[model samples]
Target: NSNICEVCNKWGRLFCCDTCPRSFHEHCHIPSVEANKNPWSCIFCRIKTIQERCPESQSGHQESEVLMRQMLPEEQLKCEFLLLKVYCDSKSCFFASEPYYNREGSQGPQKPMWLNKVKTSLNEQMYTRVEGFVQDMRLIFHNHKEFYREDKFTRLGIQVQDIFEKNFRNIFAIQETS
Candidate 1:
């Protein structure tokens, strides 16, 4: 059996679109869904279904208004901060040291007392700066490559360095312009 996905030629668990004979990896066509799920469609057929096939595609309609919203950009700005925060706030505040989300659903708005304690003890601001970004976080549990079974931590650290470097560049650019 070939390991290639018909679409991407990459290997991973693939799902079959109900409307087509072809199967695709989750990134290919699978819905942002969980396991043991059913009743899904591929990008091709799903769009086709919506465009010309589904029962809902019928008559004319009019709308007067539209609503739009976007998610908080916090994590995107601080992915490394978050991973480190998760590790730090565990019974592990004494465990690791780092600075931290704009997330919802799991733990929203109200936070635990212990979380506040460790976070308050730390001072952080836009590129406030620190050292041993490596040495300090390297001791955290989450960075154990064996735990994730991959090089996720190493790659993430690269990203952290990139973000920090970019921050410095932007700051310097602004100062020069000023």
Candidate 2:
């Protein structure tokens, strides 16, 4: 007794996801036609389903950081540069682990918004340097009131230099392995 088309919402032409309870009219569903995959699904559920059997990260880390050793040099560098950003934003430091991969979730992996800005905000060269970099990043934190509003600049300003020393070590390691 499923309802009318979720897409067109027309009566008498709806089909339900065999994998679950959601239904849609044939053409309204993604991949449009059924019988293509093992157990067919509705568009709504197809995108949101928990994907029980989908292969997970081999490293057991979240999706964003997995397969670091497998990416190309440039890509690996980008991933490494992005890792530094996690320290700046970690909300649940040790008790829960800073969530860098997926911030808030709704059943799928999330790419944090700053990762989108990394290309413009930072690069491997700048990410590789430190002494003056911390001061610069601190100045940035001071200026972009909305983005880096945390009152840890005094703390972060001091800490980021040391973190950069260690951070580059790991970043270089990523280079060798890649």
Candidate 3:
């Protein structure tokens, strides 16, 4: 009989188990039919029984849900460095094209001047400086006993580490300061 495993799509001649009604390829069975003697077990039954007995599996699923919650699109975009580039360009374009900055000049703060300075400073100083600063911060955060005191800084460090990883994967080397 040309039987196939629904799970792995491998072909072989075998019933799912001695007692179970389901059928599958012998190779698809966890132990494989060739490895076993007269008696064999089904993958479905084994897995179902494991899920029923193991509290760890449920905890693992809950952990995965928590991780999914932490995965924000905005954070990912920033971590990948796309958001920074997009924001700089948008801010520049807004400053140059819009009349609002000029109209609201000298009141509170001037957006265009502040944005231009920020764009230049980021290009000249902040990007490189922040990368090194963040790396050092992560090392300190990981090694320090007083890590609880720097929880907010440590979270920022993690975000910076993600961005640096993505950037370094694309580029050859980032210069480190002495």
Candidate 4:
């Protein structure tokens, strides 16, 4: 059995999923893998639960219309699952840290955005429409690319953005437009 976590691939106190072979760190998971969970199912397994319920696929544009009209309970679960995937795939935790002011060179991201803020907003029920949530998710990546363009984080940003985009389409059942 591999001792490395499926998410960060690091050795740590891991929470294994009951339904899958994957293991994640307590903090690496989207919901932080609570101790009270008797038999925890990872986000992928949980998302599959509703994927069967919502089988209809919609175009990217059409899905946005639907997401704007109403954020269904199941849709919300999909969003959370997508976030979990993104969080797990990230190479570093720097994306989750708040923007820090640099006294020496160029200031930090003009419009600050981070994974933790997005997660917090999602948990606080701040997003009435999935579009709002999607916007924030995009912003986090965009800001990262802009601020860290010269650094390795830019590459990581693009990588994670692809993860988010692909998972968003898959989880939401959105057909590619282009």
Candidate 5:
């Protein structure tokens, strides 16, 4: 009785994630539709699995230096986890798809920022510094704010950004400057 599809918000034979309260229909979740074995965790939970396996770096000044240095293997995993979180939260693929409208709102030049490109960059190790990866993630959220005014999608993007920042700090053990 306690169930609602996380994406569509409809009820019926939903795939209950092993971890989060969120549930999904076979197709509502990623993969379009795929049957899975028991103990099926959502993408968010999958990130946590990696987080737990990876060791946290030293916080504070050392972390600042780490962020400036080349991306470490552990750091790369954390960055991938962050991207997965974005993908999972953006259930409708709105952020994943190339935005059609320009921030100019007049069909001039459009900012080519999307989750897919960000993930691709990570996979290709295009970023030399960890902060480079972080910047791209932030840019996605920033674009959301610039493109869309206050709305459901905008709000969700902000929320995801907040979560991403928090996780970033935790994963890399970044000590808050403020």
Candidate 6:
């Protein structure tokens, strides 16, 4: 019976690639495929090749010292809070802590008293800075929409997921070793 490569759709004896678990036919190999004891590369090799050709830095863009120094404490606090909120809402974080994750509901895991105090202080400072710029929620939301684009929110979410996963794995590893 003839089999086909799951990736390239060429005919031969059907077998799954050990590396990627994708199926390919014996005759699909450029140099006639032969039974081997070790795993052969599959479609995933192409993906890795492309990724290597155009490597992207996972750390993202670095802020200049001047730009960092220019940000007020209130602005920094607001940025951190916004980033945390975005991360908490990411799909990966949500799935990892579903029952514990609170959405619009305000009942769960109230902000730490100290954190709330800090947030309130920051908000007050921010209000003082922007008293003339924004008089109400309408203007605040409008400015927020302009500053925090959807892509930024998405990136924040991914970063949050990464942080959560790393912490979770560390906790699990410690428990396992103990």
By lDDT, the best candidate is 4
RMSD of 2: 16.0
18-123, model 6: which lDDT tens digit per residue?
A: 5665565553332224467465654334334444664552223222221233335433433333323323333423222213323352333222112223234444
Candidate 4 Cα outliers beyond 4 Å, as residue runs: 57-63, 101-110, 148-154
Off by over 4 Å in 2: 35-38, 50-178
lDDT (tens digit, per residue) of candidate 1 on 1-178: 3455554456678676566666666533322223564766544454444446444433332211100111123211232333322432223333333323232322221221222232332324222222222223333333332233453443544444344344433321222222
Instruction: Give per-residue CA lDDT, model 4, range 1-178, as digits (tens).
Output: 3477876789988888888888888877766787787787877777766655655534344565646845566667767777777877655376777877553444676678877888888778788888888888888888777766587657888888888888877777676676
Residue 109 of candidate 5: its Cα lDDT? Answer: 25
lDDT of 6 at 26: 51
Native-vs-model 4 lDDT? 0.74
Off by over 4 Å in 1: 1-3, 30-34, 53-178
Candidate lDDT values, in order: 0.36, 0.39, 0.36, 0.74, 0.66, 0.36
What TM-score, over all chains together, does every model reach?
Answer: 0.26, 0.26, 0.26, 0.78, 0.59, 0.22
Residue lDDT tens for model 5, 14-109: 878777787877755543334666877765566567657653534354556756867776566667656655555644266676666645443322
Q: Model 6 — TM-score against the truth? A: 0.22
* Candidate achieving higher lDDT, 2 or 6: 2
Q: How accurate is candidate 3 locally (lDDT)?
A: 0.36
Error of 2 at 86 (Å): 33
Model 3 lDDT-worst window of ten? 96-105
* All models, RMSD in angstroms: 17.3, 16.0, 22.0, 3.1, 5.6, 19.4
Per-residue CA lDDT of model 2 for 1-178, tens digit only, reads 3686544446776777776665666644433456566676554453333223343311233222333334443433334343433333332022112223222322222322322233333433444333223334333323323323454433543454345434444433322332
The TM-score leader among the candidates is 4
